Amino acid sequence: SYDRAITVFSPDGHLFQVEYAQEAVKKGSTAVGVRGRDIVVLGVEKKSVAKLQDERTVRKICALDDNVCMAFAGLTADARIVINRARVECQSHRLTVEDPVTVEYITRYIASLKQRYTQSNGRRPFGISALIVGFDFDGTPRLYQTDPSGTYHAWKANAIGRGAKSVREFLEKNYTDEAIETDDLTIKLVIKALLEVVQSGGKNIELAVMRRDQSLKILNPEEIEKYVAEIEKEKEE
Amino acid sequence: ERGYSFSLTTFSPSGKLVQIEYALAAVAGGAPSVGIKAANGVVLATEKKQKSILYDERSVHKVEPITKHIGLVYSGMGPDYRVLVHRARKLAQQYYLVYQEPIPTAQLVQRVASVMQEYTQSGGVRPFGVSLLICGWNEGRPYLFQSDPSGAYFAWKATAMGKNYVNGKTFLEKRYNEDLELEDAIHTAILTLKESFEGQMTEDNIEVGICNEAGFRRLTPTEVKDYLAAI
Amino acid sequence: GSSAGFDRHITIFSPEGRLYQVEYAFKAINQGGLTSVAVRGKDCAVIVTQKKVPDKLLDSSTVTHLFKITENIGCVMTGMTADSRSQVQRARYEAANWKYKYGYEIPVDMLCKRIADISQVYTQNAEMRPLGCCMILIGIDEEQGPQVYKCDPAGYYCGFKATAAGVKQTESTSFLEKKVKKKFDWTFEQTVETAITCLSTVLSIDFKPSEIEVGVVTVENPKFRILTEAEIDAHLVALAER
Amino acid sequence: SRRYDSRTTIFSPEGRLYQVEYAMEAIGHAGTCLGILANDGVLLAAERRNIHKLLDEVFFSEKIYKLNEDMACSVAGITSDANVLTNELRLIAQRYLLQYQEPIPCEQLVTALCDIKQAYTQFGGKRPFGVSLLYIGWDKHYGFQLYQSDPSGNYGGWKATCIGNNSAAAVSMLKQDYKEGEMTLKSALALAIKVLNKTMDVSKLSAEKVEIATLTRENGKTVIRVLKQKEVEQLIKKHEEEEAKAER
Amino acid sequence: EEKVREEYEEILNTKLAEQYDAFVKFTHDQIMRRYGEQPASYVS
Amino acid sequence: LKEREEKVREEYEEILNTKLAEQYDAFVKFTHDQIMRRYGEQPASYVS
Amino acid sequence: IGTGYDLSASTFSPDGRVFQVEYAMKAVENSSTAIGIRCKDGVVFGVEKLVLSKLYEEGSNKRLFNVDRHVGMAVAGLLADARSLADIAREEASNFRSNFGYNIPLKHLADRVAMYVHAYTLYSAVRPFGCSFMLGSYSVNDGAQLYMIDPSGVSYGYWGCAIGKARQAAKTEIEKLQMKEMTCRDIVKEVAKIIYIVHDEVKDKAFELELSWVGELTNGRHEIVPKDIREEAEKYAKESLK
Amino acid sequence: FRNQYDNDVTVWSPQGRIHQIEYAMEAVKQGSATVGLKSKTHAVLVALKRAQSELAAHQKKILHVDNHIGISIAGLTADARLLCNFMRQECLDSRFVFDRPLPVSRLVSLIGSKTQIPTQRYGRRPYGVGLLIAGYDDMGPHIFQTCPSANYFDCRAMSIGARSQSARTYLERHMSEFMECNLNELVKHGLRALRETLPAEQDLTTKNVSIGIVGKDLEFTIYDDDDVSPFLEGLE
Amino acid sequence: MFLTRSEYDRGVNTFSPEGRLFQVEYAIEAIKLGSTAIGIQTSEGVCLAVEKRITSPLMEPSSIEKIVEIDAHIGCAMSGLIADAKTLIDKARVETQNHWFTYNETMTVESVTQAVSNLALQFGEEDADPGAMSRPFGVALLFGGVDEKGPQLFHMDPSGTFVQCDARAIGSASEGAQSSLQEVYHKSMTLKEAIKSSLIILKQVMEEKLNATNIELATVQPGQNFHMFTKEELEEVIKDI
Ligand SMILES: [K+]
């Protein structure tokens, strides 16, 4: 079996393979996630807008479970692998512990898997960064990310992929107690965050929403267009 | 003791497996081998130009039977041909044990090609340096195949491989048609070998094998003498 | 002789299809400094090798290149000595296993093919080097008569009417070819004559009996026998009188 | 040995996998294979690159491989890796059939093969499968489907796509000419012939140089039929008439 | 005696390493020029 | 004894020149084969 | 000569030389010389065991091992590899006695250990042993035997051999002996003489002579030379060295 | 490319040397000084415990191995602990199988073989630790030195670590007395040798010296900060 | 043979000419990039403090845990690549619970630190099993807790060297914090003084301003168990500065 140490410490203490996985993440499509009072919203940029494609097959927001869902930036196939293992682990935890997985538990599992690939023999780190959202059993919304290095943190709102810094600055300047008062305000906040980096509005936005005791809902293009129109009127004033 | 676990064959920046190209170069540098699919058989011919009279021509053979109805010839590195012949015999026997029917020639070609593919991608190994011509008669129809070092198999009606293989292919292209019987195919294969043969070609410096309804068999030197005299 | 990549270090193809490690293994065969000559006749096979004793402190009984594979097959090894001993040990094992599994003694061509397959494995994989030694097996087949076979590091094997391997295999090959083309019905005496004559005319030595080794098999006596100093001296005297 | 290791499964300084990219260049130099999803069927059209007239073409097809009762695929790239991948695809489809006693949904088979390709680009040091496939199928869930796969293990559901030599031009033509949800089997066949005309510029698009197979549904049974020489000739002649009529 | 040979071998190794590094960086420059223009399809 | 040292220096210079030439030949063959594709070159028999 | 083809024992030089094995031999010729001489009734070993610091105890870093009840072992080169090979030889003799039920012939122990060390001259995953060693035994039904094994793995019988820095001088002075007619009681004296001749008192300051014979005098048991006989041998060697 | 003779343990230099072994020897040489002695009835190890900072307790250097044997480490401490665990396991196995203490020389031979194994395999590295092994068995007091080269020495006294040459010089000049010394003046000689390593601005304190003694009727006991005082008093 | 980069010309288990494993030195360099951590072992407890290093206000400090609980009597402050610290924390927890299961007694802090430190150089290549680590852990840990010997503080670096420290500072600002702890430490200083001193040092070394949400402080007293301070409990000591 292959046992070369792909990820090794470089001088100055950098793990180059992890940094390169992060660079691959930086070239992925922008993904934004915002945690509201009673709704959690995930949004992804679609550079692959090409019209000869089945939108169902390139979804970048996947439901890890009935109460957990994630969006990724980076390599698509590695994201598929991590999503599949996360679903398997969710179902295993539900058998063994009787209860639905908390968001932080599956986030820890995904982070541990990425870190293990960072340090195990003969495999490169996962070139994906995630945004694991969902609701806990006690009704507390959550939002985490998992970088390729394996570090996971909780965020009120974050962006991964290209334009992460721009959208992160926008969210810093535009995440207040009022901006997440209602569901529509959260939807519009995520859409406005994406519009800071997407080429054209509406057509390049994939937006999924999760609220209490309801499964993930993929907002259809018509709803995205009507929301974007609402931001257009709001910006006019 | 543990072998390397990484592919020696990898994609070049041009987008091409250079090791397979170099294996094909070794194939193109070997003794010419020709195969002609007649309407009632197929002939496999190659030259046995030993580099001294000291070599015993009957000691080693380049046209090796695999089953009672399949034979093969190569153009490249002899030891790799021996390895692939042994593996093809193993695969044929496994098929016979499973299905109690002689292995179809297409199936044997597919399995040999799978072995070649394995050696193209597996760790610490180099691709085989032989292209095979697998001949067989089954389902009342002659067959002729060519398996390049990469493991890609092509159905052929007539082909030449080795030195002057492009000129031999042009020769065959000019002088092959559907209605050839086995004897005409043998004559044409001998002429194709002659087209690149250097010096006088005799019984012991060419090896010819045929397969028909009666099955596959190497032509004995006396029969090759009879066919050579016909020119 | 183009080169790109590690093709001169591990057994991978050069751009012209050449494996340079195999050719370097042939050079390693040459590195031994000795040459060996084998020739078969009507009812015998003879292997004659160059026996050099660099130091008078060696036990000359323990410096040999003729090895008895089985009770009926002989072997002369040219090249690196440790590799040659590995190959002879492997040949002994394969022959014994053949007898155990199949109930009859291994044919010489079969043993040469097994050793050649092992050599091919060496020249296919990348982590072990080929053995820089060459094997010349002799024996009597029940149906086909005397057998002379040779296997080189490339994995090639073939039967020979008369062959040679070592530092002077080309000159010996030319001489044996000139003698073979005549086809004058070799006997045991004539076979040992032509082997010793080839070795001497190529090396220009005129051996005393202690500078060569002779191993013979015969249809009358299929036992492999390593000729002693008396027999070799008798043959050399026969050379001298002519 | 680290000296001889080619480091196939590592990242580049700029964060890309060189081996996958090189395999994709190899595929981009391979035979053109395009598929079009129609309302009543889905078809695969593949340029044959070996045209030499000493070939026999004994088998069912040379590019189109039947994967199960209800699915088929084409290949652009290395043929031997294609063979191992298509064998693995057949194994996966039959494993679902054994486990669930029903045909495998197309996306599941694509996902399994793509997961294997991901494994080969994730660990082990082995070179990736330089094969991009082009799947056509049908299932009781999403009807007629067309799927693309990449050496990196990526896949996408396409309604019209082309892989191989001159793939970009074919994709542009398909984008211009594909009519959403209004393309029948005959319209798709005509579009395929037209696209292959401007893709095989050098070869002038004879019927001996293309292999077309259609997947339709008849009486609850899926039929995968390779188009005959006569009817491919008819398609080409009809396209020639239409091209001449354009001059009018 | 042997030290002179060792020093000459070290100098030769250093020079060969410099030339080989030049070759490696040149190939890397060509590859980065070649594959930088188009975006990777797999990353998304 | 310095004559042997000068001879060793000359041999080292010749060896360095030969090694540099061989390395350059290897590099140019590498560039011609693995890189620098030709537009008019159809792929080999194994690409289909 | 190298710098591109001397990185692994699994690589052949363009002229067919495995440079790693040659570097192991270079390692073994930079060690203190160990000599062994075979006589009518046994073999006597001798070692110029240098004492690197005087803080060591007399008998530290022995180079005369005892691999079986009737076989000795003199070593030169890296002592870690010498001890590892001593354990390998001990295990081979133990396994031989366990399976075949009698003492291993030294002609077979030498072959087994030589093949073991040859296995390390083929692969890039391992390195050749940096120690050449001698084996010596005496049995009434097989006589006195002396064999040398070097990093390549070649085994030859010797009437007398030397391994280490002063191999050439030791062999030159051993040839002056007539060991074929002498007995152990005199061969030990001459071994001390040879070791003291080949030793240089200006480069390596101090050394202690380590002697051991196996032979008829010891019923086949390989024993360290008794203290009184060692004192007499050193007395003779010093007087001769004048 | 690079020096191509230094990275791998399985690559011989054209001079017949393995540079990785020498680099592990350097690892031993960079460690803090240890010095050990032996009388005809005792074997004493005294080590110079080094402190990372003025607020950090000094590293333990004498480690228990068995009822009747002990070691003093110098080099990589994790390698030292792994080799110490191997030694302890071998001693316990000898006590289990034979119900007798394991002879010191045989234990050192096992250490030599175990440390030689990685000397010859690809990817492996030499044990970058040098061990001063002092034990008492039927053959009297023993002191041993083991190098990363898997070569071990039967010593009468030895010092390994940083500035060890001064301690070795002191030991050499005063070897003749060690045999007839009692425990107190034997450990005084050891402390003098260890002081010879220290620079001019420092001297032995109960903080930076540890003493391990094994003898005829003496459990191997490591003497620590408070307990070193009776041996320390009376040097200078 | 071209395009090979010198990143992998050396193996993982290779020594430098100075006798230091290259990977261990690189992991030590990685330690100097982590958040600063401070620990003081007083006679009435052990205190551990670490900066959170909040990159952006959207990140919740409650999630970024750089101090953890090995058991009721052991804590751990981590600096460096926190992703690598979790394997060691899990191993320490497993060892503590195994020791309780087997012996019915709390495992000594020194024994826990030793058990975790044995993992530090257990990394390699093909020589080992598939589950073997490929690189040293880029984490320095400050184990602190109370046991039979009283309050204990330990420091383990990637080299596997674990050493008992009266007051140790690790992370980016290790040197300045260590000099300050030298200036302030007395063998008879109380836990309240230790906490105040540690927070003062953190304020001196932190780039961000010290507040109740950008540090974590925990104590292990000979009485009560491992305790994580909170808001309304960390302001009560921050205000004094
Ligand atoms: K090889």
How many Cβ atoms from other residues are within 10 Å of residue D244's Cβ?
9
Q: What angle do CA I165, I171, I174 make, to 5 degrees?
A: 60
Q: Give I47's strand partners.
A: I40, I219
Q: Give D133's strand partners.
A: D75
A29 in Cβ contact with E44 (< 8 Å):
yes
Domains for chain I: give ranges and CATH numbers: 15-239 (3.60.20.10)
How far apart are the C-alpha atoms of H157 and H134, rounded to whole Å?
10
Tokens of H199: 């620079």
Which residue in H2, H127, I17, H122 sits closest to D2, CA to CA? H122
Distance from residue B54's CA to the centre of ligand 1 (Å): 29
Torsion of CA I62, I66, I70, I76, to 10 degrees: -140
E34 in Cβ contact with B13 (< 8 Å):
yes
Tokens of D116: 């294997």
Cα-Cα-Cα-Cα dihedral sign, residues B99, B100, B104, B108: positive
Residue G27, CB-side half-sphere exposure with 13 Å CA sphere: 31
Domain enclosing residue A195, as ranges? 9-236
Cα-Cα-Cα-Cα dihedral sign, residues D3, D4, D5, D11: positive
Q: Tokens 């081998």 belong to which residue? A: B33
CB contact under 8 Å between H123 and I124, yes or no, is yes
Distance from residue C24's CA to the centre of ligand 1 (Å): 11
Torsion of CA B105, B110, B113, B118, to 10 degrees: -140
CA distances from I93 to A34, C69, I109, I158, I221 (A): 34, 63, 12, 19, 19
- The phi-psi region of residue C163 (left if phi > 0; otherwise alpha if psi is between -120 and 50; otherwise beta) is beta
Distance from residue I48's CA to the centre of ligand 1 (Å): 58
The reply to whether A91 falls in a domain is yes
CB contact under 8 Å between B20 and F34, yes or no, is no
Q: Tokens 């129609």 belong to which residue? A: D38
Spatial CB neighbours of D168, under 8 Å, sequence gap ≥ 6: none
Which residue in I74, I71, I80 sits closest to I30, CA to CA? I80
Cα Dmax for chain I:
64
Domain enclosing residue H60, as ranges? 1-236
B45 in Cβ contact with B184 (< 8 Å):
no
Which residue in I174, I115, I170 sits closest to I139, CA to CA? I170
How far apart are the C-alpha atoms of A177 and F30, rounded to whole Å?
62
CB contact under 8 Å between D16 and E41, yes or no, is no
DSSP string covering D211-245: EEEEEEEETTEEEEEEPPHHHHHHHHHHHHHHHHH
Phi, psi (degrees; rounded to nearest 5) at G83: -65, -40
The amino acid at residue G137 is S
Which residue in I190, I195, I193 sits closest to I210, CA to CA? I195
Which residue in A16, A36, A56, A38 sits closest to A148, CA to CA? A16
DSSP string covering chain D: -TTT---TTS--TTS--HHHHHHHHHHHTS--EEEEE-SS-EEEEEE-S---TTB---SS-SS-EEEETTEEEEEEEBHHHHHHHHHHHHHHHHHHHHHHSSPPPHHHHHHHHHHHHHHHTTBSSPPP--EEEEEEEEETTTEEEEEEE-TTS-EEEBSEEEESTTHHHHHHHHHHHPPTT---HHHHHHHHHHHHHHHSTTT---GGGEEEEEEEEETTEEEEEEPPHHHHHHHHHHHHHHHHHHH-
CB contact under 8 Å between B158 and D54, yes or no, is yes
F33 in Cβ contact with C15 (< 8 Å):
yes
Buried b (16+ CB within 10 A) or exposed e, A66-94: bbbbbbbbbbbbbbbbbbeebbebbeebe
Q: Give G125's strand partners.
A: none
- Count CB pairs under 8 A between chains A and D: 102
How far does CA A156 lie from the centroid of its chain?
13
How far apart are the C-alpha atoms of H115 and H73, rounded to whole Å?
15
Q: Structural domain tally of chain H?
A: 1
Tell me, what DSSP letter sits at residue G216? G
Tokens of D224: 């995968």
CB contact under 8 Å between E20 and F23, yes or no, is yes
CA distances from G156 to A145, C52, G134 (A): 70, 13, 10
3-state helix, strand, coil in chain I (%, to 5): 30, 25, 45
* H78 three-state secondary structure: helix
**Chain A adjacent subunits, 3+ CB pairs under 8 A:** B, D, E, I
* B185 three-state secondary structure: helix
Tell me, what DSSP letter sits at residue C62? G
Q: Which residues of D touch F46 (CB under 8 A)?
A: 78-80
Distance from residue E28's CA to the centre of ligand 1 (Å): 29
How far apart are the C-alpha atoms of B94 and B72, rounded to whole Å?
18
Q: Give C146's strand partners.
A: C140
Which residue in H69, H51, H79, H61 sits closest to H106, CA to CA? H69
Which residue in I162, I171, C212 sits closest to H77, CA to CA? I162
Q: What angle do CA B218, B223, B226 make, to 5 degrees?
A: 150
How far apart are the C-alpha atoms of B11 and D18, rounded to whole Å?
9
Which residue in B49, B53, B51, B52 sits closest to B31, CA to CA? B49
Q: Which residues of G touch D3 (CB under 8 A)?
A: 7
The reply to whether A2 falls in a domain is no
How far apart are the C-alpha atoms of F42 and A9, rounded to whole Å?
43
Reduced 3-state DSSP string for H167-236: HHHHHHHCHHHHCCCCHHHHHHHHHHHHHHHCCCCCCCCCCCCEEEEEECCEEEEEECHHHHHHHHCCCC
Per-chain residues with Cβ under 5 A from ion ligand 1? C 11
Q: What angle do CA I103, I109, I114 make, to 5 degrees?
A: 90
Resolution of the experimentally solved model in angstroms: 3.2
Q: Which residues of B touch E26 (CB under 8 A)?
A: none
Q: What radius of gyration, in Å, describes the C-alpha atoms of chain C?
A: 18
CA distances from B22 to B15, B130, B148, B166, C127 (A): 15, 11, 12, 17, 20
Phi, psi (degrees; rounded to nearest 5) at G64: -115, 90
3-state helix, strand, coil in chain H (%, to 5): 35, 25, 40
**What angle, 0 to 180 degrees and rounded to 10, lies between the N-to-C axes of helices D185-199 and D167-177?**
140
Q: What is the CATH classification number for the domain harbouring A40? A: 3.60.20.10
CA distances from H81 to G13, H75, H92, H106, H185 (A): 43, 11, 16, 19, 30
Cα end-to-end distance, chain G, whole Å: 43
Element (H, E) at H89: helix H77-98
The reply to whether A94 falls in a domain is yes
Q: Tokens 């360290």 belong to which residue? A: G224
Tokens of I135: 């690189």
Distance from residue A81's CA to the centre of ligand 1 (Å): 37
* B155 three-state secondary structure: strand
How far apart are the C-alpha atoms of I217 and I202, rounded to whole Å?
11
Phi, psi (degrees; rounded to nearest 5) at A42: -125, 140
How far apart are the C-alpha atoms of H127 and H129, rounded to whole Å?
6
Tokens of G143: 């006589």
Q: What angle do CA A90, A96, A98 make, to 5 degrees?
A: 85
Q: Which residues of C touch F26 (CB under 8 A)?
A: 3-5
I95 in Cβ contact with I76 (< 8 Å):
no
Tokens of I76: 């751990």
H127 in Cβ contact with H118 (< 8 Å):
yes
How far apart are the C-alpha atoms of H231 and D99, rounded to whole Å?
79
How many Cβ atoms from other residues are within 10 Å of residue D79's Cβ?
25
Cα-Cα-Cα-Cα dihedral sign, residues H105, H111, H115, H117: positive
Chain C closest CA to G120's CA: distance in Å?
A: 10
Which residue in I38, I71, I2 sits closest to I140, CA to CA? I38
The reply to whether A1 falls in a domain is no
CA distances from D214 to D66, D110, D134, D143 (A): 11, 19, 13, 15
Q: In what order do the strands lie in the sheet with I162-164?
A: I67-71, I74-80, I139-147, I150-156, I162-164
Spatial CB neighbours of H131, under 8 Å, sequence gap ≥ 6: H71, H72, H73, H74, H80, H83, H84, H111, H144, H145, H146
The reply to whether A194 falls in a domain is yes
Q: Least CB-CB distance to B83: which of C13, C16, C120?
A: C120
CA distances from C136 to C109, C115, C146, C203 (A): 11, 11, 13, 19
How many Cβ atoms from other residues are within 10 Å of residue D63's Cβ?
27
- As to burial, measured by CB atoms within 10 angstroms (0-12 exposed, 13-18 middle, 19+ buried), residue B217 is middle
Q: Tokens 């050493």 belong to which residue? A: I163
G169 in Cβ contact with G197 (< 8 Å):
yes
Q: Which residues of D touch C4 (CB under 8 A)?
A: none
DSSP string covering G35-52: EEEEETTEEEEEEEEE-S
Residue A193, CB-side half-sphere exposure with 13 Å CA sphere: 36
Element (H, E) at I209: none
Chain A contacts in chain B segment 87-126 (CB below 8 A): 123
Domains for chain D: give ranges and CATH numbers: 18-247 (3.60.20.10)
CB contact under 8 Å between A1 and I130, yes or no, is yes
How far apart are the C-alpha atoms of C89 and C105, rounded to whole Å?
17
CA distances from A223 to C11, D56, D136, I48 (A): 63, 57, 32, 51
Which residue in C197, C186, C162 sits closest to C41, CA to CA? C186
Distance from residue B92's CA to the centre of ligand 1 (Å): 29
How far apart are the C-alpha atoms of A24 and A162, rounded to whole Å?
10
CA distances from C140 to A160, B72, B141, C40, C223 (A): 78, 30, 43, 10, 9
* B136 three-state secondary structure: strand
Interface membership of H14 toward E (CB under 8 Å): yes
CA distances from D173 to B47, D25, D167, D197, D234 (A): 52, 21, 10, 11, 22
CA distances from D25 to B16, D110, D126, D131, G91 (A): 8, 22, 18, 11, 57
Which residue in G149, G170, G144 sits closest to G159, CA to CA? G144
Cα-Cα-Cα-Cα dihedral sign, residues I201, I203, I205, I206: positive
Q: Structural domain tally of chain A?
A: 1
Which technique was the structure solved with, according to the deposited record?
cryo-EM
How far apart are the C-alpha atoms of C205 and C227, rounded to whole Å?
20
DSSP string covering G74-134: EEEE-HHHHHHHHHHHHHHHHHHHHHHSSPPPHHHHHHHHHHHHHGGGSBTTB---SEEEE
CATH number among 2.40.30.10, 3.60.20.10, 1.10.3720.10, 2.60.120.590, domain B11-230: 3.60.20.10
